[PDB]
Amino acid sequence: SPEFMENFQKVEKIGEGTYGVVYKARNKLTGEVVALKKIRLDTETEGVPSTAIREISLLKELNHPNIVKLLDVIHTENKLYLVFEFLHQDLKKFMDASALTGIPLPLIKSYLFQLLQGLAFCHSHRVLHRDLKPQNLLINTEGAIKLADFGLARAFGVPVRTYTHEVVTLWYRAPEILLGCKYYSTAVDIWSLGCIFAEMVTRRALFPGDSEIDQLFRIFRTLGTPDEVVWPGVTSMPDYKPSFPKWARQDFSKVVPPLDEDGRSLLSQMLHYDPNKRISAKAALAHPFFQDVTKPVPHLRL
Ligand SMILES: O=S(=O)(O)c1cccc2cccc(Nc3ccccc3)c12
Ligand SMILES: O=S(=O)(O)c1cccc2cccc(Nc3ccccc3)c12
């Protein structure tokens, strides 16, 4: 039987992703609580780009424990309401609440492993996230972490508004995107996740830039300014400028102090400059860093 917006009682606002506010709501007929996302459409031109429609279709096809579950899509007067499973807690909020002590390594390992499983699945199905950041990763009481807030709308020009609150998306953006690559690859998500891995460990964002050029320079100052030896083709990328300062690479003992050689090995493979050399999500799952991975439950005192 079709669901109608009248069937839902708004409880509270639980956030405001790239598509406006997200509300916790209660289904009046089943009593189930869900997360509702409101999407304002745009018949401004004539419709949604065919390629966009295909990408939304691709995302809808995915069913995985590490991808937030879409339960239904309600259509009403130029508006779309996405009905999702209810989750309300995210990695950003959790890290802020674990600021004083940091998230324990077993949980860091579990979350990273699960996010890699989610990404491996998406990537094998030709789906990229494109906007991975702590804010977009939802967690539940049982220890799962899930991908959400995919960067689909801005990537394929979907007729809908975005970033109701603001931005900070630059911090996790892969260098090939910052340098204007004609075509990027699934490797961009691995870069983002590597930044998130480092952030969980150090309790601070790795490259908190305030502009594309500042973002690039922050990356260069830490990993060294790339050259043809380290990244073949970099000096010919659209936005590459020979005038870029030349910085030497920093040691990870300094960049991510708490990590040992297994952690450093994996991090270095996730932050490799060359997209063609950056570790894939599938290969990362087999990294020695995950030998002892388990599924700890988070301490959530809401
Ligand atoms: O495919 S749907 O499941 O609706 C869908 C699900 C989730 C997000 C969507 C965003 C834009 C357009 C859609 N489709 C659409 C198609 C026809 C009319 C209005 C919207 C979206
Ligand atoms: O909301 S997200 O968490 O990204 C999301 C998560 C999981 C499955 C999704 C399926 C279709 C569209 C989404 N979002 C969407 C919304 C508006 C425009 C384009 C895509 C999905």
From Swiss-Prot:
GO terms for cellular component: Cajal body; centrosome; chromosome, telomeric region; condensed chromosome; cyclin A1-CDK2 complex; cyclin A2-CDK2 complex; cyclin E1-CDK2 complex; cyclin E2-CDK2 complex. Keywords: Acetylation, ATP-binding, Cell cycle, Cell division, Cytoplasm, Cytoskeleton, DNA damage, DNA repair, Endosome, Kinase, Magnesium, Meiosis, Metal-binding, Mitosis, Nucleotide-binding, Nucleus, Phosphoprotein, S-nitrosylation, Serine/threonine-protein kinase, Transferase. Residues 8-290 form the Protein kinase domain. GO terms for molecular function: ATP binding; cyclin binding; cyclin-dependent protein kinase activity; cyclin-dependent protein serine/threonine kinase activity; magnesium ion binding; protein domain specific binding; protein serine kinase activity; protein serine/threonine kinase activity. Induction: Induced transiently by TGFB1 at an early phase of TGFB1-mediated apoptosis. The modification Phosphotyrosine is found at Y19, Y23. The modification N-acetylmethionine is found at M5. Mg(2+) binds at N136, D149. The modification N6-acetyllysine is found at K10. Changing L170R: Reduced phosphorylation by CAK and reduced kinase activity. Phosphorylated at Thr-164 by CDK7 in a CAK complex. Phosphorylation at Thr-164 promotes kinase activity, whereas phosphorylation at Tyr-19 by WEE1 reduces slightly kinase activity. Phosphorylated on Thr-18 and Tyr-19 during S and G2 phases before being dephosphorylated by CDC25A. Nitrosylated after treatment with nitric oxide (DETA-NO). It holds the Pfam family Pkinase. CDD domains: STKc_CDK2_3 (cd07860). Phosphorylation at Thr-18 or Tyr-19 inactivates the enzyme, while phosphorylation at Thr-164 activates it. GO terms for biological process: cell division; cellular response to nitric oxide; cellular senescence; centriole replication; centrosome duplication; chromatin remodeling; DNA repair; DNA replication. Binds 2 Mg(2+) ions. Belongs to the protein kinase superfamily. CMGC Ser/Thr protein kinase family. CDC2/CDKX subfamily. Found in a complex with CABLES1, CCNA1 and CCNE1. Interacts with CABLES1. Interacts with UHRF2. Part of a complex consisting of UHRF2, CDK2 and CCNE1. Interacts with the Speedy/Ringo proteins SPDYA and SPDYC. Interaction with SPDYA promotes kinase activation via a conformation change that alleviates obstruction of the substrate-binding cleft by the T-loop. Found in a complex with both SPDYA and CDKN1B/KIP1. Binds to RB1 and CDK7. This is Cyclin-dependent kinase 2. The lineage of its organism: Eukaryota, Metazoa, Chordata, Craniata, Vertebrata.
